[PDB]
Amino acid sequence: EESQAFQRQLTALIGYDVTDVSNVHDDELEFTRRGLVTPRMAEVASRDPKLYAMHPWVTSKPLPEYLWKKIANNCIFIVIHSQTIKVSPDDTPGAILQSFFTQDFVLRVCGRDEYLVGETPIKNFQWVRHCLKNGEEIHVVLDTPPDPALDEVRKECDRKFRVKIRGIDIPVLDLTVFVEANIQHGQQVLCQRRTSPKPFTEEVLWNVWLEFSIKIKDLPKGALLNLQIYCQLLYYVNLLLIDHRFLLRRGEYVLHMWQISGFNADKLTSATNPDKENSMSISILLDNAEMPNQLRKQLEAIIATDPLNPLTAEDKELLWHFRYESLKHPKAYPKLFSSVKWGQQEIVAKTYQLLARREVWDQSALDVGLTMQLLDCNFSDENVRAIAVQKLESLEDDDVLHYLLQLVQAVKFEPYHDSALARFLLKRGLRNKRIGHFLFWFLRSEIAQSRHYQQRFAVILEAYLRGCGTAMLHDFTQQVQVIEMLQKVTLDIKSLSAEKYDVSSQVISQLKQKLENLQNPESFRVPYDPGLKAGALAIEKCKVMASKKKPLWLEFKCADPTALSNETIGIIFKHGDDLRQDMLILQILRIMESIWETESLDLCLLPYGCISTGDKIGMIEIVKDATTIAKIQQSTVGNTGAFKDEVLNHWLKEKSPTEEKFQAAVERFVYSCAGYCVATFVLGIGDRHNDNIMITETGNLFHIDFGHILRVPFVLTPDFLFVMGTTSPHFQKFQDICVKAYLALRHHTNLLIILFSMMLMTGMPQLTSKEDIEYIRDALTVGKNEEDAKKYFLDQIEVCRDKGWTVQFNWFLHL
């Protein structure tokens, strides 16, 4: 029936068929599809049709200090389409309109799907704050409110634990293998057993009972039997010992395992390898007063250490014995719940009784760095994780958008498909279309290139698509059609000039040919900027990048006729690199901008849009009027390491007509340069090549390519300095802003550390040992007073000065 065709539509939008039961050994996934029906219908029935249709992008945070200095005498100007109007920062849009009349029309941004509606002061609209930040004019058309009808929804024992290892079987690959069974709880290995080593052949039968030290009723929920094969670790797979019904897992299992590549979130999945033809299989059978002062000081010191400082045994004993004292310190919760013997039923009982009375945690102000910690790989207990989700519930949509990528990623750490976190994401995406757009694209990113989690993520994405309404479904469908067309063009063009050729006649020929052939997809929403709709292509402006991986430089017209400007929307389509790394780094940069805003700073970061759409394939926003610092060098002294340091300021002058425009660009440059210095330093991506640093004609600096990130702490070359002048008066400004921004980030050390380690676990595999994570703790001068930290950053600046083009000259000889 047509219901089946609708499920087909959903499948095509998802990129995976959630009704497939070809790679399941239980009904957990379908159980979750069924359990999600209620949160979906409940948020749908709960949301306001009008605000959900117009999706006003609002914030309750106060107006920053740097935006106030840009205001007139309590007088924001709104150009309505077409007269200008004075308005008070605290003037509601409704009051604005009733003032403009002296009845039901709504103000929509010109050239955008963005609306200034709701009982919010224009002070508090992100588009208005963005216009103020960039000194643009709030241009609005008096449109008629979109029909909410277009959002309508298609209505829907004391025995010890034993595991029998029968054997392993592969048709692939003189070695020797043994099997290893672990009872794991949140990366805590409760107990461990091994089989004897038998020669590695395509079939190894043990028929061996591995008896564990843990008793059946001490198994905690969320505990995993982790089965691994060693020759080095060759393969792994995981089975939940308590399923989604709290039933002890019994029966026969034949689990197709994951292969290792010669620690990260894939090693945790409960999913089995779908590739049953080539993948290693394993076969198994289951059948079953108050403290003294010195101790107070020690406990406080422990609670004070950072999220990476590991807890010794005595530390955990102290935290557990004084658990009720520790419960008053919400900052101690991550460490307290790591001091819990989860393999002991009585201790987990005491732990739940502890969580029972948590008035201090409930009342505390939301601390995201703490919530995230509780949501990471070190916490399986769903009750421990549910309090983090509880705190998350109080985030406004603006903050949800700030943290949505890494919350979605954090879903990879949930033991079960249906989690508090999953339902929270579902709710927030259904309540608000901007969150829903990005939830769609993030879930789909992972569903398109992760067998390890595509099933769970596909269940969540289907749950979302069944409540977002048919309008947004049509939008997603158009977008997916367009992106698939364009990825087809990208790959087919990549095939045509594989290596060692810059650009051919035939190449540009075929590219323009296909783009002309493809345009006969009328209009689609820009995935990295859902307020922008792209129209026809500007075939004449589209080109093959002429990079190693020949990415596509495409440009579209804006489909919105109310659009004021005539600028095209530029998108780069790239295949060959894993752009999820870029998504993560850019999202951390956005969090850094947010942190800086809390302290009335603006470092003019340009976190360009970037959506990973598949396996080593994605799109990148084209910042208009931007060029590489390397290219500005080459243009005046081409193919030479001389790197004449006077050239950047000459270029700035050239592109800025008015000396005043030049000074504005120089100040923009001071700020954006300080911001990128601090950010790349903290993240350990500051030692980049001249070619991966771009600048807008208006002086805004910004880095690109966060996959190719490999000595110097960051890039502060003699040419940036010449744009500053070297001591000088603007270089003093640079150092001042840098110390301020660095200290501002050190004020959120914990959040930055948890986000960084999460990125390491969920982005690219690389090394991702403890060692990679520790660098950031170092760069944030953990356990240091702010004075020494400012000294540390100024020492980094001085190393930059001393090295000169040595760094850049070697980057040039190397590339």
Ligand X SMILES: CN(C)C1CCN(C(=O)c2ccc(NC(=O)Nc3ccc(-c4nc(N5CCOCC5)nc(N5CCOCC5)n4)cc3)cc2)CC1
Contact footprint for ligand X (CB under 6 A): 572, 577-579, 581-582, 608, 620-623, 626, 628, 691, 694, 704-708
Nearest-approach distance from CB 763 to ligand X, in angstroms: 9
Say if residue 268 carries a ligand binding annotation.
no
Nearest-approach distance from CB 198 to ligand X, in angstroms: 36
d(CA 166, CA 210): 11
Q: Return the number of the residue (611 or 682) whose C-beta is nearest ligand X.
A: 611
Say if residue 380 carries a ligand binding annotation.
no
Q: Return the number of the residue (242 or 622) whose C-beta is nearest ligand X.
A: 622
Say if residue 532 carries a ligand binding annotation.
no
Whether the CB-CB separation of 542 and 498 falls below 8 Å is answered with: no
Q: Return the number of the residue (454 or 581) whose C-beta is nearest ligand X.
A: 581
Q: Return the number of the residue (91 or 705) whose C-beta is nearest ligand X.
A: 705
Say if residue 709 carries a ligand binding annotation.
yes
Going by C-alpha positions, the residue among 699, 676, 700, 704 that lies closest to residue 608 is 704
Q: Return the number of the residue (479 or 696) whose C-beta is nearest ligand X.
A: 696
Of all residues in this chain, which one has the CB nearest to ligand X in the complex? 707
d(CA 720, CA 728): 13
Structure tokens at 166: 């029968």
Three-point CA angle 217, 218, 222, nearest 5°: 100
Say if residue 572 carries a ligand binding annotation.
yes
Number of H helices, E strands in the chain: 30, 24
Say if residue 577 carries a ligand binding annotation.
yes
Q: How many CB atoms lie within 10 A of CB 615?
A: 11
Say if residue 235 carries a ligand binding annotation.
no
d(CA 353, CA 355): 6
Going by C-alpha positions, the residue among 275, 587, 671, 551 that lies closest to residue 409 is 587
Q: Return the number of the residue (234 or 630) whose C-beta is nearest ligand X.
A: 630
Q: Return the number of the residue (120 or 449) whose C-beta is nearest ligand X.
A: 449
Amino acid at 689: H
DSSP string of 591-613?
A: HHHHHHHHTT---------EEEE
Nearest-approach distance from CB 814 to ligand X, in angstroms: 13
Residues 6+ apart with CB under 8 A from 601: 66, 737, 740, 741, 744
Secondary structure letter of residue 541 according to DSSP:
G
Say if residue 267 carries a ligand binding annotation.
no
Nearest-approach distance from CB 465 to ligand X, in angstroms: 28
The torsion angles phi and psi of 661, rounded to 5 degrees, stand at -60, -40
Going by C-alpha positions, the residue among 571, 568, 552 that lies closest to residue 508 is 552
Say if residue 710 carries a ligand binding annotation.
yes
Q: Return the number of the residue (368 or 526) whose C-beta is nearest ligand X.
A: 526
Say if residue 31 carries a ligand binding annotation.
no
Q: Return the number of the residue (629 or 666) whose C-beta is nearest ligand X.
A: 629
Say if residue 737 carries a ligand binding annotation.
no
Q: Return the number of the residue (572 or 776) whose C-beta is nearest ligand X.
A: 572
Say if residue 610 carries a ligand binding annotation.
yes
Query: Residues followed by a break in the chain, C–N over 2.5 Å?
Result: 81, 102, 156, 173, 231, 262, 288, 520, 710, 726
Structure tokens at 676: 């990128």
Say if residue 648 carries a ligand binding annotation.
no
Nearest-approach distance from CB 646 to ligand X, in angstroms: 22
Say if residue 705 carries a ligand binding annotation.
yes
Q: Return the number of the residue (151 or 577) whose C-beta is nearest ligand X.
A: 577
Q: Return the number of the residue (271 or 620) whose C-beta is nearest ligand X.
A: 620
- Cα–Cα distances in angstroms (integers) from residue 492 to residues 507, 612, 709, in the given order: 11, 19, 28
Nearest-approach distance from CB 651 to ligand X, in angstroms: 15
Nearest-approach distance from CB 192 to ligand X, in angstroms: 33
Three-point CA angle 196, 201, 204, nearest 5°: 45
d(CA 32, CA 489): 37
d(CA 523, CA 239): 46
Q: Return the number of the residue (401 or 579) whose C-beta is nearest ligand X.
A: 579
Say if residue 417 carries a ligand binding annotation.
no
Say if residue 615 carries a ligand binding annotation.
no
Question: In 657-710, where do the E strands start and end?
Answer: 693-696, 701-703
Nearest-approach distance from CB 552 to ligand X, in angstroms: 12
Going by C-alpha positions, the residue among 657, 509, 681 that lies closest to residue 589 is 681
Going by C-alpha positions, the residue among 602, 805, 639, 657 that lies closest to residue 722 is 805
Q: Return the number of the residue (690 or 750) whose C-beta is nearest ligand X.
A: 690
Q: Return the number of the residue (270 or 696) whose C-beta is nearest ligand X.
A: 696
Say if residue 133 carries a ligand binding annotation.
no
d(CA 429, CA 52): 11
Nearest-approach distance from CB 585 to ligand X, in angstroms: 9
Nearest-approach distance from CB 483 to ligand X, in angstroms: 17
In what helix (H) or strand (E) does residue 701 lie, and over which residues does it extend?
strand 701-703
Nearest-approach distance from CB 571 to ligand X, in angstroms: 9
Alpha-helix runs per DSSP H in 381-419: 382-392, 397-410
Whether the CB-CB separation of 70 and 132 falls below 8 Å is answered with: yes
Whether the CB-CB separation of 368 and 751 falls below 8 Å is answered with: yes
Nearest-approach distance from CB 617 to ligand X, in angstroms: 11
Distance of CA 217 to the CA centre of its chain: 38
Nearest-approach distance from CB 624 to ligand X, in angstroms: 8
Say if residue 607 carries a ligand binding annotation.
yes
The torsion angles phi and psi of 499, rounded to 5 degrees, stand at -155, 150
Nearest-approach distance from CB 181 to ligand X, in angstroms: 33
d(CA 420, CA 809): 52
d(CA 580, CA 228): 28
In what helix (H) or strand (E) does residue 296 lie, and over which residues does it extend?
helix 293-304
The torsion angles phi and psi of 313, rounded to 5 degrees, stand at -60, -50
Say if residue 576 carries a ligand binding annotation.
yes
Q: Strand, coil or helix: what is 74? A: coil
Amino acid at 25: H
Whether the CB-CB separation of 302 and 329 falls below 8 Å is answered with: no
Nearest-approach distance from CB 584 to ligand X, in angstroms: 10
Say if residue 62 carries a ligand binding annotation.
no
Q: Strand, coil or helix: what is 726? A: coil
Binding-site positions: 570-579, 605-613, 702-710
Query: Residues comprising the binding site for ATP?
Result: 570-579, 605-613, 702-710
